[PDB]
Design a protein around this nucleic acid. Structure first.
Ligand SMILES: [Mg+2]
Ligand SMILES: [Mg+2]
Ligand SMILES: [Mg+2]
Ligand SMILES: [Mg+2]
Ligand SMILES: [Mg+2]
Ligand SMILES: [Mg+2]
Ligand SMILES: [Mg+2]
Ligand SMILES: [Mg+2]
Ligand SMILES: [Mg+2]
Ligand SMILES: [Mg+2]
Ligand SMILES: [Mg+2]
Ligand SMILES: [Mg+2]
Ligand SMILES: [Mg+2]
Ligand SMILES: [Mg+2]
Ligand SMILES: [Mg+2]
Ligand SMILES: [Mg+2]
Ligand SMILES: [Mg+2]
Ligand SMILES: [Mg+2]
Ligand SMILES: [Mg+2]
Ligand SMILES: [Mg+2]
Ligand SMILES: [Mg+2]
Ligand SMILES: [Mg+2]
Ligand SMILES: [Mg+2]
Ligand SMILES: [Mg+2]
Ligand SMILES: [Mg+2]
Ligand SMILES: [Mg+2]
Ligand SMILES: [Mg+2]
Ligand SMILES: [Mg+2]
Ligand SMILES: [Mg+2]
Ligand SMILES: [Mg+2]
Ligand SMILES: [Mg+2]
Ligand SMILES: [Mg+2]
Ligand SMILES: [Mg+2]
Ligand SMILES: [Mg+2]
Ligand SMILES: [Mg+2]
Ligand SMILES: [Mg+2]
Ligand SMILES: [Mg+2]
Ligand SMILES: [Mg+2]
Ligand SMILES: [Mg+2]
Ligand SMILES: [Mg+2]
Ligand SMILES: [Mg+2]
Ligand SMILES: [Mg+2]
Ligand SMILES: [Mg+2]
Ligand SMILES: [Mg+2]
Ligand SMILES: [Mg+2]
Ligand SMILES: [Mg+2]
Ligand SMILES: [Mg+2]
Ligand SMILES: [Mg+2]
Ligand SMILES: [Mg+2]
Ligand SMILES: [Mg+2]
Ligand SMILES: [Mg+2]
Ligand SMILES: [Mg+2]
Ligand SMILES: [Mg+2]
Ligand SMILES: [Mg+2]
Ligand SMILES: [Mg+2]
Ligand SMILES: [Mg+2]
Ligand SMILES: [Mg+2]
Ligand SMILES: [Mg+2]
Ligand SMILES: [Mg+2]
Ligand SMILES: [Mg+2]
Ligand SMILES: [Mg+2]
Ligand SMILES: [Mg+2]
Ligand SMILES: [Mg+2]
Ligand SMILES: [Mg+2]
Ligand SMILES: [Zn+2]
Ligand SMILES: [Zn+2]
Lengths: 104, 91, 245, 49
RNA sequence: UAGUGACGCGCAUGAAUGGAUGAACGAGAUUCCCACUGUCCCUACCUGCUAUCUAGCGAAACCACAGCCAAGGGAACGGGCUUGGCAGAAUCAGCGGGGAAAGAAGACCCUGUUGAGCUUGACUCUAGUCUGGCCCUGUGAAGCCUCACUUACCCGGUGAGGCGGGUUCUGGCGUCAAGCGCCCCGCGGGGCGCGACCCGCCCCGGGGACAGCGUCAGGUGGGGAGUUUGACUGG
RNA sequence: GCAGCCAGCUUAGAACUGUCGCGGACCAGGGGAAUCCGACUGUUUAAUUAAAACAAAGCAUCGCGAAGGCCCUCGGCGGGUGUUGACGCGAUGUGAUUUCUGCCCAGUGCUCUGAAUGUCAAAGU
RNA sequence: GACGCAAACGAACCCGGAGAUGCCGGCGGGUGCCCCGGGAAAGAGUUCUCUUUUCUUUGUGAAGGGCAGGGCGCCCUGGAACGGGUUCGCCCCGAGAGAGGGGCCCGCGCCCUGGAAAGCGCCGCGCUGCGGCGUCCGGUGAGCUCUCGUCGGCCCUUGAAAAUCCGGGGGAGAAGGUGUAAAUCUCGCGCCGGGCCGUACCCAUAUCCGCAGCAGGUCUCCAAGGUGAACAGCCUCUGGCGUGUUGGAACAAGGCAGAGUAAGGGAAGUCGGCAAGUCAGAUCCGUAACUUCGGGAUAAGGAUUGGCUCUAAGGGCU
RNA sequence: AGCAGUUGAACAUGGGUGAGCCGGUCCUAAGGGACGGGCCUACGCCGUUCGGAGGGGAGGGCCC
RNA sequence: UGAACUAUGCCUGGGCAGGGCGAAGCCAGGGGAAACUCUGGUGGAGGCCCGCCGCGGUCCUGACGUGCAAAUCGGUCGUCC
């Protein structure tokens, strides 16, 4: 059991000073500063509490270097709205338009 | 099961704050932390987030209600008054 | 003597409001053509908690009639409204809880909230939790309406003052007796630095006109005149009467 | 501190170059008038501010 | 002479200058009991670090001169003076009788025509505030006053977006015009009008010559400023 | 229906046993019956006072609907409360709960009138 | 179908997401550490006796690919009461369970590329750098941390903004007329650049502050073995160190400390049980007056406690 | 360097801090503080997203 | 001229062993004609308890009192979601 130290000037256990223990080829356990965990997008509806599916959960500026296929799905509102609410958006748009023809 | 005789939920306060005050918060803490039946989805999941904020965990409906209850008696009385005051306008 | 505690609150150094986590100024949608000759349809998006007040706020989403945009309004949440319902604001709005319409277009005895004191100020009266205002009478000749404020005062306002139908949500908040001094600490930690109030009799004569003496008596009549100078105007300011009543 | 500004490091560089004793040939020049550097500072007994 | 329970014409208890009560809580004040012990009877022994001695190192307070007493007298309690007792180098470790020992121009007390903090029914003022006149302050009408007028002035709203006169059946969608008419370029291209009515002098509301500003006048004003608060006297 | 194999760590019971000694060091609440005060937790005189003092929840009163209450600034009708609106803000007293909170408005003070007889400035007459 | 494919035109404007959400509790996944079994290899310690023994070493970066593992109010089929599923707790279900088959996210775990060539361990030769061999196989846990999750609890407390980045809506536009063009978010690949400033050391019983190498003060990170409930005290390993601005010799008085001990008495001491003495952990019993019914309470008062040899019960897997 | 010293954080002579990917730099938090305006005899002060003819950028080729 | 000490407020960060009492909620089993009660377990609330770090500073009116220190030291002690 060897006691390891920080590898940077920051000496406080802040949200940016987060590390993980990594074993090196020199058989040493050193600190490896981890990236903060990313979050997959939420549905633009504001109802479904779960996150979207088919999208990487990375940091915002990491999305710049990812390809477009990894940031959405092949649906209409895919990548911004969940599949459940898109079906509701289509049926609500259709049925309301039908009620506006009945009044005519 | 019957572990306390009178205090119930206010047993967390022990011997503090007085009997009549612990009895007064008891009626409120029960209704404050109560799971109410949702009038939108039918499930009994209307729990309180903050003052006047009541949210359901299934239909995701947030309702502006009372501080310690889902609806105060002053709101159902006004809602019944505004309802009949609207009926006297159309006629 | 020195400047008393009551005077130091006007300089606003440590007595300013704690407005870091507040969500904004709760006010009605500003009066436009859609609210003078009709109504505008607004959807309630979320009912949020405003730090510092016991009344929730509704994030009602409207549609701008002059540009393609969605206006987000922060209204006082009337008790009964919910996310997903449509709030209609304007002159031709129907008398439903949550709608905003002038007092002149509402029958006598209508319970309203977030009432405008003057036409256009976007709501000044009956804004705290559980409070409301009642429409007493009208006067189409002078276009003035008489309303009853939650303090029992009857104010004559214009008939164009807009208000939300219903009572402010969060009612009965003062009915729960605070038990710990810590709950009062957190109550005012979000509002301002005013909770721990030292009694003037518990001070020295230098910092309060009630302090001093080998006992903690007031020594002087606590009822003080209204024209008393700042630093002396403590106790019961211009008290018409005293006692248990 | 390891974190220095350029002005502070440039200020400490000047004081570090003035903390040198007088040259030996100076005493032969002025006739032993300046016997020692009276502005020598130590890092413990006198601070810079 | 404590504690507790009673007694109460209580020097001089008392009801939010809160009275009475009270579980729990208290490095709060107090009394008693058990247990416990060197608190004591009554002290003893042991250990470490010191003191002590030594090598090296090496201050300070303090100091008129100094340093044995008794009585005497004396500024009324000598160390020196008087009369006696007497009196022997140089030192060590202790000690706390004395040096009216040191530390500090007594902090108590009094005095000073020395202050300061603070308080009022002290003296004299003052910010603020209340009120009146004048001033910005004009206009119309009625019987100085009231009611009107808007343009002064004031307030509020707004990205100054529709002023005056002639879309409620759902937690969708709405973004620079489709269409029509007219006209100009060399079937590609362009403009204009209607759509989206006309006129207007003030952006829209709420007050309005009132608020408010300026300036004098009266009241209030320990909030604040300045100052005073005799003397004699068996302190 | 179990046989085989593997895997710990606790608990209970019993015998035997030593000088009845065994939480063997270390670690580690003396207890009881009462009175007073403050309910409690919290706070406080850095460097003599940690308390019965302060705060406290609760209770009660007072002011105020915004051309406002309270307060700041030499000053802007500038600024704080106020991103506030009486279930709020501001000013006091009392001090949990329980139980009650009597009598006195003469005095002082506050406040309300103006069928207001006096006193009564400047200006105006 | 969830959604997947290396890409997969698209402005104004709009919508949304990420940045960007507290504290506390339970549980689960993963590393690190610790622990156990190899009658495992390489050195070393002990070897009077005993000890197939004791000690040490037994490893792999980022990034990328693949796969365990974990998570999902994600989808399809379908249909539930004799209600069922299920957690430590809960919770879930005709707004659709169970079951079956899928999908997505996180994968810091394992494998691979890196990459054994390097690093460690051992042995050998040479000299004043060259070689050999090895770097193995498992077991687990109320173990301790860190981390990723999940489910809750608490608030009259709701626990940041912005830069930046992304998705969608929109269809204004752009592109060529029969093989291409416009266009390309293809870690497919190639080409070029990334300036300026800080960077040593101390960070505290001697590098800071307190006049000093001052028993004071001064914000954090890492953290082993044994005992034990313990990050308690006590002992040890790794690491550090000479006892904290001096040595030697004595062991008087009087001090300070060891909270040293003390016969018999037990507060008679003292303003006053001041002081320290008693009690103490754990298990099994037993706990009053009073009370706001919560408490009081470890009330009070008892018994037990070591060592050794056994018995019994509490699991998993095929 | 309160004894010593062959020792030192003393003295003397030299040497030493190398970055696109560690931080500053970028962002605004509380806040500070210009601008417009107002105030102030003035030095100046007030005030902070409001309040001014506060835009210096276009697409499209001289036009919105 | 000072808020590098301290007082309060604001913003953004960091931190607080192991145990104890054990409340709502939940499960199952008894008693009853019913109203409903009783028992066990689970659960883990609290300006809850013991207590380490930390933050405080009660007593000895201990040490020290030309001190280590112009306020320190020791034991004891308060609190420690
Ligand atoms: Mg405060
Ligand atoms: Mg109070
Ligand atoms: Mg108080
Ligand atoms: Mg006092
Ligand atoms: Mg007084
Ligand atoms: Mg009192
Ligand atoms: Mg009093
Ligand atoms: Mg120094
Ligand atoms: Mg006695
Ligand atoms: Mg008595
Ligand atoms: Mg009395
Ligand atoms: Mg009374
Ligand atoms: Mg009295
Ligand atoms: Mg105490
Ligand atoms: Mg003399
Ligand atoms: Mg002297
Ligand atoms: Mg003198
Ligand atoms: Mg005189
Ligand atoms: Mg004076
Ligand atoms: Mg003074
Ligand atoms: Mg005075
Ligand atoms: Mg005299
Ligand atoms: Mg009594
Ligand atoms: Mg107390
Ligand atoms: Mg009490
Ligand atoms: Mg306390
Ligand atoms: Mg003190
Ligand atoms: Mg105390
Ligand atoms: Mg008191
Ligand atoms: Mg009371
Ligand atoms: Mg009172
Ligand atoms: Mg009276
Ligand atoms: Mg498209
Ligand atoms: Mg968790
Ligand atoms: Mg698109
Ligand atoms: Mg370094
Ligand atoms: Mg030190
Ligand atoms: Mg200095
Ligand atoms: Mg251990
Ligand atoms: Mg730690
Ligand atoms: Mg330990
Ligand atoms: Mg030594
Ligand atoms: Mg030292
Ligand atoms: Mg001795
Ligand atoms: Mg002793
Ligand atoms: Mg002893
Ligand atoms: Mg004895
Ligand atoms: Mg005695
Ligand atoms: Mg005696
Ligand atoms: Mg004692
Ligand atoms: Mg007791
Ligand atoms: Mg020396
Ligand atoms: Mg040398
Ligand atoms: Mg060196
Ligand atoms: Mg040097
Ligand atoms: Mg502070
Ligand atoms: Mg304690
Ligand atoms: Mg502690
Ligand atoms: Mg401490
Ligand atoms: Mg101490
Ligand atoms: Mg004490
Ligand atoms: Mg004592
Ligand atoms: Mg002492
Ligand atoms: Mg001494
Ligand atoms: Zn959705
Ligand atoms: Zn619901």
């Amino acid at each position: 059991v060897q006691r390891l130290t920080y590898r940077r000037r920051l000496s406080y256990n802040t949200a940016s000073n987060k590390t993980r223990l990594s074993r090196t080829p020199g058989n040493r356990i050193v600190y490896l500063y981890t990236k903060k965990t990313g979050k997959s997008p939420k549905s633009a509806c504001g109802i479904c509490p779960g996150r979207l599916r088919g999208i990487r959960a990375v940091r915002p500026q990491v999305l710049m270097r990812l390809s477009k296929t990894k940031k959405h799905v092949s649906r209409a509102y895919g990548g911004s709205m969940c599949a459940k609410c898109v079906r509701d958006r289509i049926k609500r748009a259709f049925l309301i338009e039908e009620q506006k023809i009945v009044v005519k | 099961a019957k572990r306390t005789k009178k205090v119930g939920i206010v047993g967390k306060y022990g011997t503090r704050y007085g009997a009549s005050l612990r009895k007064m918060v008891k009626k409120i803490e029960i209704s404050q932390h109560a799971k109410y039946t949702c009038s939108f989805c039918g499930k009994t999941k209307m729990k309180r987030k903050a003052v006047g904020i009541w949210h359901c965990g299934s239909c995701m409906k947030t309702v502006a209600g009372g501080a310690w209850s889902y609806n105060t008696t002053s709101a159902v009385t006004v809602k019944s008054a505004i309802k009949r005051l609207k009926e006297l306008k159309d006629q | 003597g020195r400047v008393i505690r009551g005077q130091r609150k006007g300089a606003g150094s440590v007595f300013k409001a704690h407005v870091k986590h507040r969500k904004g100024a709760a006010k009605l949608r500003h009066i436009d053509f859609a609210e003078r000759h009709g109504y505008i349809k607004g959807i309630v998006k979320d009912i949020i908690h405003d730090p510092g007040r016991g009344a929730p706020l509704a994030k009602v989403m409207f549609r701008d009639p002059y540009r393609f945009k969605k206006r987000t309004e922060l209204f006082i949440a009337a008790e009964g409204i919910h996310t997903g319902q449509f709030i209609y604001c304007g002159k031709k709005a129907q008398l439903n809880i949550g709608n905003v319409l002038p007092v002149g277009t509402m029958p006598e005895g209508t319970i309203v909230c977030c009432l405008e004191e003057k036409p256009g100020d976007r709501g000044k009266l009956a804004r705290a939790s559980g409070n409301y205002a009642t429409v007493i009478s009208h006067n189409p000749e002078t276009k003035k309406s008489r309303v009853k404020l939650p303090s029992g005062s009857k104010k004559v306002i214009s008939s164009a003052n807009r208000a939300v139908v219903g009572v402010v949500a969060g009612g009965g908040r003062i009915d729960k007796p605070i038990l710990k001094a810590g709950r009062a600490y957190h109550k005012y930690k979000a509002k301002r630095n005013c909770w721990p109030r030292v009694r003037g009799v518990a001070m020295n004569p230098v910092e309060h006109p009630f302090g001093g003496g080998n006992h903690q008596h007031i020594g002087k009549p606590s009822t003080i005149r209204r024209d008393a100078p700042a630093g002396r105007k403590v106790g019961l300011i211009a008290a018409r009467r005293t006692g248990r009543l | 501190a390891s974190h220095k500004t350029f002005r502070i490091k440039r200020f400490l560089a000047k004081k570090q170059k003035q903390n040198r004793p007088i040259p030996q040939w100076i005493r032969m020049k002025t006739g032993n008038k300046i016997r020692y550097n009276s502005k020598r500072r130590h890092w413990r007994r006198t601070k810079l501010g």
